Design an enzyme around this catalytic site. Structure first.
Site, PDB file in Angstrom:
ATOM      1  N   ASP A   1      33.636  37.151  40.061  1.00 52.20           N
ATOM      2  CA  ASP A   1      35.181  36.824  40.340  1.00 52.20           C
ATOM      3  C   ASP A   1      34.954  37.011  41.892  1.00 52.20           C
ATOM      4  O   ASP A   1      35.248  38.267  42.304  1.00 52.20           O
ATOM      5  CB  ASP A   1      36.086  37.435  39.569  1.00 52.20           C
ATOM      6  CG  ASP A   1      37.423  36.447  39.854  1.00 52.20           C
ATOM      7  OD1 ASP A   1      37.603  36.176  41.055  1.00 52.20           O
ATOM      8  OD2 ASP A   1      38.043  36.403  38.506  1.00 52.20           O
TER       9      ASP A   1
ATOM     10  N   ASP B   1      35.128  29.565  41.798  1.00 49.86           N
ATOM     11  CA  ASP B   1      34.213  30.566  42.482  1.00 49.86           C
ATOM     12  C   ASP B   1      32.877  29.843  42.973  1.00 49.86           C
ATOM     13  O   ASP B   1      32.267  30.268  43.811  1.00 49.86           O
ATOM     14  CB  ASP B   1      34.013  31.565  41.503  1.00 49.86           C
ATOM     15  CG  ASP B   1      35.177  32.575  41.178  1.00 49.86           C
ATOM     16  OD1 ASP B   1      35.470  33.097  42.210  1.00 49.86           O
ATOM     17  OD2 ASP B   1      35.704  32.678  40.158  1.00 49.86           O
TER      18      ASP B   1
ATOM     19  N   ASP C   1      38.929  42.025  38.290  1.00 50.69           N
ATOM     20  CA  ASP C   1      39.199  40.874  37.611  1.00 50.69           C
ATOM     21  C   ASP C   1      38.107  40.484  36.756  1.00 50.69           C
ATOM     22  O   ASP C   1      38.424  39.906  35.333  1.00 50.69           O
ATOM     23  CB  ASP C   1      39.622  39.854  38.289  1.00 50.69           C
ATOM     24  CG  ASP C   1      41.004  39.556  38.811  1.00 50.69           C
ATOM     25  OD1 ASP C   1      41.861  40.182  38.406  1.00 50.69           O
ATOM     26  OD2 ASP C   1      41.007  39.384  40.158  1.00 50.69           O
TER      27      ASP C   1
END
Lengths: 67, 276
Positions: free
Chosen positions: B65, B165, B226
């Site tokens: 992430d 991402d 995250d």
RNA sequence: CCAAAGGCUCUUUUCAGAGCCACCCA
């Protein structure tokens, strides 16, 4: 205006056949409205989401002649 | 197989249960009892399916992430540069986080982090100023995966919370750094897509945890945290019997979905991409 | 009327299973 597309009609009919080819459906027609499950009308114009849902609620409903 | 007939019937039976009825059986069978109605319906259905039915799967999953330079208002035409590159290694058998990698990245253009960015991500100007360039960190990340023997001894896949991402951040970061997009990163598992299909419930990491009865642990918008929270979600889904699959890829620099109708996609061992 | 319905797509796990798009990602 209604549903004219043959491929849509055919797909819907098959879906209906799946419901009618149940025994709960034959138990139904033996015995038998307002709550009585009504078969979805394939010539009606409906979104994919709506048609499928109606078919889902209809099939569940027919089992009132089962578990 | 006739046993599936029995399953479809119990499925309908579980479809008509109320939350308490659901919560009751799960408790009775000593299973996770937290989560919204849909989570529980699904959790209970797989218990049966699983019971009435009695690898080719990934050995590890790399949760990634990224955090990037940003600006107040979150404008659409912004050129983001990765500032944090985290990786969390999830052992699918053990179902535990085996190891982690974290490095900050010094951006070449937006050398100065806006205030919004600093407060959002918690990454400070000093952390980035003394960090390395993307290519360098990418090298280190790849060397770390090689040490884990990913792609060679172990079957693995990349996993991300969404499709940006890979399709956006890493994509433009590669363009900015002038290197070829890494082949090992062209396919991946978009946990949100999976979560939505599996439980039938927008998607924020924060909302997925909530509907699961889970509390966030760590600083939000910290790349590593995250990632670690996304791994808690993947673990729980694997435990609720979901077979996470690579479901999105990069083709012609364009986002495309991978068919759930194809054999388990194995990701190539990592290799540092070339410049140009 | 009602009912159904985000726009779509696949399968007899059809009292059921699966997926794409949209929405979301700093």
């Amino acid at each position: 205006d209604f549903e004219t597309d043959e491929s849509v009609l055919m797909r819907r009919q098959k879906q209906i056949n799946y419901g009618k080819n149940t025994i709960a459906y034959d138990r139904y027609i033996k015995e038998v409205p307002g709550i009585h499950p009504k078969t979805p009308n394939k010539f009606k114009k409906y979104s994919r989401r709506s048609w499928d849902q109606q078919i889902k609620l209809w099939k569940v409903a027919l089992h009132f002649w089962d578990p | 197989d006739p046993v599936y007939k029995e399953i479809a019937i119990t499925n309908g039976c579980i479809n008509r249960m109320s939350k308490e009825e659901l919560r009751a059986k799960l408790s009775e069978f000593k299973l996770e009892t937290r989560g919204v109605k849909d989570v529980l319906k699904k959790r209970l259905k797989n218990y049966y399916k699983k019971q009435k039915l009695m690898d080719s799967y990934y050995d590890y999953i790399c949760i990634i992430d990224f955090e990037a330079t940003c600006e107040e208002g979150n404008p659409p035409e912004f050129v983001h540069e990765i500032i944090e590159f985290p990786v969390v290694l999830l052992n699918t058998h053990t179902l535990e986080i085996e190891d982690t990698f974290q490095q900050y990245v010094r951006p070449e253009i937006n050398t100065q982090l806006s205030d919004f960015c600093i407060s959002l991500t918690g990454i400070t100007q000093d952390q980035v100023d003394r960090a390395d360039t993307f290519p360098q960190v990418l090298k280190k990340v790849i060397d770390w995966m090689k040490l884990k023997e990913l792609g060679t001894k172990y079957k693995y896949s990349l996993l991300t919370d969404g499709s940006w991402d890979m399709s956006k951040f890493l994509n433009i970061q590669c363009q900015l750094s002038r290197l070829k997009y890494p082949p090992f990163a062209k396919k991946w598992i978009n946990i949100r897509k999976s979560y939505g299909n599996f439980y039938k419930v927008q998607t924020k990491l924060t909302i997925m945890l909530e509907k699961l009865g889970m509390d966030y642990d760590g600083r939000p918008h910290c790349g590593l945290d995250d990632s670690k929270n996304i791994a808690r979600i993947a673990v729980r889904m694997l435990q609720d019997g979901c077979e996470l699959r690579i479901n999105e890829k990069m083709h012609a620099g364009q986002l495309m979905s991978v068919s759930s109708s194809l054999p388990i996609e194995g990701t190539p061992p990592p290799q540092m991409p070339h410049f140009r």
